[PDB]
Structure formats: C-alpha cells, structure tokens
Amino acid sequence: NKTVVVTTILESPYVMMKKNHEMLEGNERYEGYCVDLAAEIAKHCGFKYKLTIVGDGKYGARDADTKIWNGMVGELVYGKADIAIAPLTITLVREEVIDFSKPFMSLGISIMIKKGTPIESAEDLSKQTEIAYGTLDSGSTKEFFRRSKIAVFDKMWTYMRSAEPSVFVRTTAEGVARVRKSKGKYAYLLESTMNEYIEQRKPCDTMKVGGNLDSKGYGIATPKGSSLGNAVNLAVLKLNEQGLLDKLKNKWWYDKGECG
Amino acid sequence: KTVVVTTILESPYVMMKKNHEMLEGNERYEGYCVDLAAEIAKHCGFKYKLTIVGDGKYGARDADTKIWNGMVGELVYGKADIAIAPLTITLVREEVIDFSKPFMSLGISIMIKKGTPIESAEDLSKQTEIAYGTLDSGSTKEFFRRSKIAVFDKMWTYMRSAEPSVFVRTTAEGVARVRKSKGKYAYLLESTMNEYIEQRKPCDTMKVGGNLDSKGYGIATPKGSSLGNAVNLAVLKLNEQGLLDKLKNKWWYDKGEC
Numbered sequence A: 001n002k003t004v005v006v007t008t009i010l011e012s013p014y015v016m017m018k019k020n021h022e023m024l025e026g027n028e029r030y031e032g033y034c035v036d037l038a039a040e041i042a043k044h045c046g047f048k049y050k051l052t053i054v055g056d057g058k059y060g061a062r063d064a065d066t067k068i069w070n071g072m073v074g075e076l077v078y079g080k081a082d083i084a085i086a087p088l089t090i091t092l093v094r095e096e097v098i099d100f101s102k103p104f105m106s107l108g109i110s111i112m113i114k115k116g117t118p119i120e121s122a123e124d125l126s127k128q129t130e131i132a133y134g135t136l137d138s139g140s141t142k143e144f145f146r147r148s149k150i151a152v153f154d155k156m157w158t159y160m161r162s163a164e165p166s167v168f169v170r171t172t173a174e175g176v177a178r179v180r181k182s183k184g185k186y187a188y189l190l191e192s193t194m195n196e197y198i199e200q201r202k203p204c205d206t207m208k209v210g211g212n213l214d215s216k217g218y219g220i221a222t223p224k225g226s227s228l229g230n231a232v233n234l235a236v237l238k239l240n241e242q243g244l245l246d247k248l249k250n251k252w253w254y255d256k257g258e259c260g
Numbered sequence B: 001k002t003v004v005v006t007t008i009l010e011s012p013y014v015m016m017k018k019n020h021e022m023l024e025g026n027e028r029y030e031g032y033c034v035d036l037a038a039e040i041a042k043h044c045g046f047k048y049k050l051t052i053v054g055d056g057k058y059g060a061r062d063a064d065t066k067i068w069n070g071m072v073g074e075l076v077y078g079k080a081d082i083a084i085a086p087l088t089i090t091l092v093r094e095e096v097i098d099f100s101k102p103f104m105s106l107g108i109s110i111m112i113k114k115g116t117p118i119e120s121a122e123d124l125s126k127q128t129e130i131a132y133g134t135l136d137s138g139s140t141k142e143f144f145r146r147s148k149i150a151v152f153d154k155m156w157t158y159m160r161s162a163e164p165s166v167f168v169r170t171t172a173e174g175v176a177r178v179r180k181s182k183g184k185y186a187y188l189l190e191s192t193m194n195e196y197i198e199q200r201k202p203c204d205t206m207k208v209g210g211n212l213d214s215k216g217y218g219i220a221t222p223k224g225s226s227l228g229n230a231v232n233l234a235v236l237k238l239n240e241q242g243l244l245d246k247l248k249n250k251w252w253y254d255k256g257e258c
C-alpha cells in the first residue's frame, strides 16, 4: 500500500495555486475542479495520493524524432506517475499507450474571440487573413488540425503551420492574453471547457462563437494495465451518477463567475 | 467466427427497411447503429450477424431472480458477442459487461405535446394535472429509482405509484401516448430520440428544458472479451475521422417536415 502519485497540470480552473500557497505544503497548495475530483476519486477508491505538477507543463505528445512522450502522458508512460487527473483529452494515439477511464467531462474544440470580432465559425476564419488564429503549441487541438482531412480544417492548418510570426502559444493563458491584447486581430482555438471558463472571468471581454468543431472527453489516465484503472473508472461512473461531477462543474465555472 | 451482434429496434438507430419482409439477414435493417456496426466490423476485420434482442429490452437485473434481461443479458449469458445499440453506459452495467468509450453523448430529457405548460423537471414534480413517465425498463427508469436528488426523487415517488401505469414498453408507445393525451402526458426519454422525433411529422412534440443528466452510449462486449480492445480503438478512430458526426447528420438529417 503506497501513496499514489498524481500528475496534473496548472490550468484554471482544474488546478490553481491557492491564495496563501507560499506558506502551504503538499496537496494543500492547490485548489480547483481536478483537486476536488482527485479527492473524491481517492476516497471512493481508498488511497492516499500526492499531487505533482507535470515538469514540462505539457499534456502529452510523442516527439517524431526521438519518439519520446512528453507531458503528463510521458509521466505515465515512463512510470513517473501512477495516475493523471487533469483536462487530458481521450485520443486514439494516447489510448494506444495509456488507459483512460470513461469521460468525466465532455468538450469540443471551440473558437474564442475578443468581443466584437466579426467571426462566427471556423469557415469564417478559413476564408480571411485579417484575423490571425492559432492553437496551443502542443496537444490534441493542434493535432486535430494537423491530421484533419476535412477541407476547412486542413485549410486552417496549412495557414497556421506556416504563419509568421507563430500563431501557436505555449499555454492557454498566453492564448487568452493574445486574444485580449490583439484588438480583434487574433482568435484562439481551444477546448470548449477552457473557453466557457474564461468567458466567465473579468474583464469579460471574450466569448465562444459558433458550435464546437468536434466532440470528445476528458478521462482519468493510468499506465497501461495498471490495477488502479478499474476502480477509478467505476468511481468516475458513480460520481457522475450521483450528480457530483455536475456539481463540481458548476462550482468552478459558474457559481462564482465574475460576469453576472 | 461470425460475430453475433445484439441490437434493438429503436429509431433512428435500428429500423426495418421498407419491404423488409422480402429481405434477409443484415439487409433487413437500416439506421445509425446499422452503419456503425458496418464501420466497426470493417475496422476490426470481422464478419457479423445483426440480431434483434428477443425480449426487446435494453437490460436490467431482475430483483427476484437476479437474471439480466435485454441486450445486457444476451452478453452476460453468452448469447451474443457484442451489443451495438443506444445502450447507456452505467455503473451497474459496467460491473457486468465492458463498454467502449462513448460514441454518442446524451441526457435524460422531457418530451411534451406542443403547448403543454411545462418547462422543466421541477415543473412536472410540482403538479399532478399532467402525468409523466418513462420506459418501464432501462436506464431512465433506474435513474429516477436510484436518485437522491430532491426533485427527481419526488418525481419517482409519484411515477412508481401512479394509476394507471405511466410506464411504457417502448419509446414508440411513450411518444404515441404524448401525442394522444392532449397535453396530459409528458414522456421522460433520452435526448437523442427526443430530438429525432421533434423533427418528424406530425411535428406535434418538442423537447423542453435542458437535459437532466449527461452520459453516453457505448458499444458493449462480454466482460474481459478480447474483442473489447479492438472495438474501442475503432470507436476512437471513427470519432477522430469525423465519421460519427457524419452518421449523426445522416440519421438526424432534417428534411424540413417540421
């Protein structure tokens, strides 16, 4: 019986530093949707755990050259962590190297704009050059565009991959700042969950426009064939059925939203 | 070597083709799950036979005998190799069979005859003039049975004892019931079918309010079945290729009737 090492990522509102973090230690340093979820999962499954922020601050991709996995996925693949509890998208390529619970939350790639930006759809973005647009420099959204056979998305990708200066960002926060500071000349492609969160935060100058480009989910991830998998999956299903997940979403997204 | 698929007659997931009486085997059927089965079969490299579950149920454990019925029973008792249907992923089922990651999202929803003065579950629970129920078996009924949420528990205590029965054997009967009850019956069912029916003639029903929960349908296999892994990767590949979105638009394609 050992302490479970949880890899996660500093991404609001899933995991955030508490106000007095500088005088706090261990799990108490952090707060958020995934901090609450880790607590609920640990309890229903009966384990102790340590929250650790992934070192490279990444979600998880395989370098094409070295073939090494980075991010939280790499943490699991190379045995640095026992479980990942984070807004980590279930994808085919990931499912080939790690296990995922059934989804604890749904999302889709979405478009964030500065209020007043004349854009309603991915098709609008694709037909113009005045407003620039990009995605997270890594992760499942970038990979969606790189791999898409759908004409509109492929056209967006061919623009994005070669835009100068770079339209990609290192973090969600950077994407948000870029939309906010660009006077309507930048739109950010990101998962609907983050988009809806930011829409509820001061200065309330962003919004999600149009439908989602796809439909997918976040799953709790474990090393392939890990014994923890089964219990965590059942825990996620129980929590969903009790309404606890809906409660958590409301708590961190809307309950104390700052935009009325 | 021929995979046996248990599925269920449920529009627009699986439906009898026009002139099916002269058709044979898999060609008797059409719909979202028929296309999905074909796609899954192609990606996993197997031949298959579609079979309509004998008792016409999704799957529940009998309280007395503790025997599983419906499509879940078919997998649990070795009658089928895989279930490809709008079968809801639930904790209780996940304990006895395996599920792929979801191929479709849904939630429990409210169907009313147009003009009914109801906008939400809370409304229903606060009145008695308009009756309401669910399928006499399946995950929607179980949802209300198990719920500790105030409004939903109140709805359940009403529905379980209401006279005559507010439960129906098939979705078609629930829908017929809403249509024929002049606004005196509301039907609780999953959002996917609600939205489908809303766009079909006579265009006299509608979904009202948001969904009561959020869950998904998964392709099911007997517990620990080998087929499980391949089928899950296939579902994920189909999603990422946009094939699942294509199938949804095809079968919920709005011709305009409503």
Ligand SMILES: O=C(O)[C@H]1Cc2c(O)noc2CN1
Pocket (backbone or CB within 6 Å): A059, A060, A087, A088, A089, A090, A135, A136, A138, A139, A140, A141, A142, A172, A189, A190, A191, A194
């Ligand atoms: O799992 C993943 O790769 C990432 C990608 C992503 C994004 O683009 N916006 O938000 C997120 C969180 N999930």
Ligand SMILES: O=C(O)[C@H]1Cc2c(O)noc2CN1
Pocket (backbone or CB within 6 Å): B058, B059, B086, B087, B088, B089, B134, B135, B137, B138, B139, B140, B141, B171, B188, B189, B190, B193
């Ligand atoms: O899987 C299941 O038990 C059933 C339940 C249900 C319902 O109530 N309306 O539609 C359905 C399909 N899923």
Ligand SMILES: [Cl-]
Pocket (backbone or CB within 6 Å): none
């Ligand atoms: Cl409990």
Ligand SMILES: [Cl-]
Pocket (backbone or CB within 6 Å): none
């Ligand atoms: Cl292919």
Ligand SMILES: [Cl-]
Pocket (backbone or CB within 6 Å): B060, B136, B137, B138, B141
């Ligand atoms: Cl029952």
Ligand SMILES: [Cl-]
Pocket (backbone or CB within 6 Å): none
């Ligand atoms: Cl009683």
